[PDB]
A paper describes a structure:
We found that while [name] encodes the guanylyltransferase [name] (unusual type [name]), which arrests bacterial growth, Rv1044 encodes the atypical protein kinase TakA (unusual type of atypical kinase antitoxin), which neutralizes the activity of [name] via phosphorylation. It encompasses an N-terminal domain (NTD) and a C-terminal domain (CTD). The NTD (1-181aa) exhibits an α/β fold that commonly found in nucleotidyltransferase-like proteins. A large central cavity is formed between NTD and CTD.
We observed a strong positive difference map peak connected to the hydroxyl side chain of residue S78 of wildtype [name], which was absent in D82A. The additional electron density could accommodate a phosphate, thus we modeled a phosphoserine (SEP) at this site instead of a serine. SEP78 fitted the electron density of a composite omit map calculated with simulated annealing. Specifically, the phosphate of SEP78 is virtually located at the very center of the cavity, where it stays in proximity to all residues inside the cavity. The distances measured from the phosphate group to residues G62 (motif 1), D80 and D82 (motif 2), K189 (motif 3) and D208 (motif 4) range from 3.9 Å to 6.4 Å. R76 from motif 2 specifically interacts with the phosphate via two hydrogen bonds. The molecular surface analysis of the [name] structure demonstrated that the phosphorylation of S78 may not only influence the local electrostatic charge in the central cavity, but also introduce a protrusion on the right-side wall of the cavity which can potentially block access to the cavity. Collectively, our crystallographic data suggest that the phosphate group may inhibit the activity of [name] and in turn the toxicity. A fragment 71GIPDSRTSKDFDTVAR86 from wildtype [name] was observed; the calculated molecular mass for S78 was 184.9984 Da, matching the theoretical molecular mass of phosphoserine, 185.07 Da, confirming that S78 was phosphorylated. To test our hypothesis, we first compared the GTP binding affinity of the phosphorylated and non-phosphorylated [name] species. It was evident that the phosphorylated [name] exhibited lower GTP binding affinity than the non-phosphorylated [name], which supports the theory that SEP78 impairs GTP binding.
Author numbering: 4 to 292
The structure:
């Protein structure tokens, strides 16, 4: 177990190689996970004047934090929800990246807005160029979206020991959007009907929705039902409860989304996945306050 932090990039990549092989994961998956953790630590330093998070992590990065690399889909985006205007978010991140964290620094590209149907303030996308001790390390796509209903009223705090395993001991603690709101948002996305030039490709959300249902265990579903109502009404598109339809090109997209998850108990076909998620929708709608 390394007693000092990596003295340079080459030492860091070499150490990541060894832990990846020891853990039986793909090197590039572990390296991308570490880049995401670093970006998340920068985001965790962003706080209002009472000390509460300004940014909550969501999406595939959140699921990898909750379940670990072996039990989560491979994803690349670092999706977040902000409680402040994004022009404030970008500058605060750029400040945090210059100061750095445990030898990591980052520079952020300019934010570009994205068109959306159902939120008045459009999300933003930019990239983080990471370096470790002066030398470029990795790039992370970043998406920042605005709060919806109560989806930033609370947060879970997740961790990862990946950097500790390579000799960087500082504690990792990442504020994340809670599961009820992740479910609401993925249920809306996976059932959305997009206009004629576009087509919904989000079969992978059917995998994540199965994973999120498992994470809720025997919890009461009332908070999830409430979150689902709030998001579907907030967006004012298709109504709650939706129909979990599959599109003709989804069979192979869903199969792609299962890559590396053979050891889990998941629906193995897109039809069975849609059936599972439809049962979850009905069970959510049933919950009685
Ligand atoms: Mg706190
Ligand atoms: Mg989500
Ligand atoms: Mg995602
Ligand atoms: Mg996968
Ligand atoms: Mg996002
Ligand atoms: Mg709430
Ligand atoms: Mg908050
Ligand atoms: Mg659809
Ligand atoms: Mg709950
Ligand atoms: Mg559909
Ligand atoms: Mg097929
Ligand atoms: Mg499986
Ligand atoms: Mg069921």
């Amino acid at each position: 177990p390394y007693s000092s932090p990596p003295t340079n990039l080459r030492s860091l990549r070499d150490r990541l190689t060894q832990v990846a092989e020891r853990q039986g994961v793909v090197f590039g998956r572990l390296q991308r996970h570490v880049a995401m953790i670093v970006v998340a630590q920068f985001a965790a330093t962003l706080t209002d004047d009472t000390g509460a998070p300004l940014l909550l992590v969501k999406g595939g990065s959140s699921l990898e934090l909750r379940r670990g690399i072996p039990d989560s889909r491979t994803s690349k985006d670092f999706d977040t929800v902000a409680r402040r205007d994004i022009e404030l978010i970008h500058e605060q991140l750029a400040d945090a990246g210059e100061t750095g964290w445990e030898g990591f620094t980052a520079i952020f590209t300019a934010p570009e807005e994205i068109d959306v149907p159902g939120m008045p303030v459009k999300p933003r996308r930019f990239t983080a160029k990471l370096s470790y001790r002066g030398r470029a390390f990795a790039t992370v796509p970043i998406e920042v979206s605005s709060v919806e209903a109560g989806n930033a009223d609370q947060f879970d705090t997740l961790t990862s020991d990946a950097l500790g395993l390579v000799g960087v001991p500082a504690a990792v603690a990442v504020p994340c959007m809670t599961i009820p709101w992740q479910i609401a948002q993925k249920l809306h996305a996976v059932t959305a009907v997009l206009e004629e030039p576009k087509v919904n490709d989000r079969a992978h959300d059917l995998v994540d929705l199965q994973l999120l249902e498992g994470l809720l265990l025997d919890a009461d579903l009332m908070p999830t039902r409430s979150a689902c109502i709030a998001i579907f009404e907030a967006r004012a598109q298709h109504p709650w409860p939706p129909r979990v339809a599959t599109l003709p090109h989804w069979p192979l997209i869903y199969a792609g989304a299962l890559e590396g998850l053979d050891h889990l108990e998941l629906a193995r076909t897109v039809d069975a996945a849609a059936q599972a998620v439809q049962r979850f929708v009905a069970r959510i709608d049933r919950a009685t306050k």
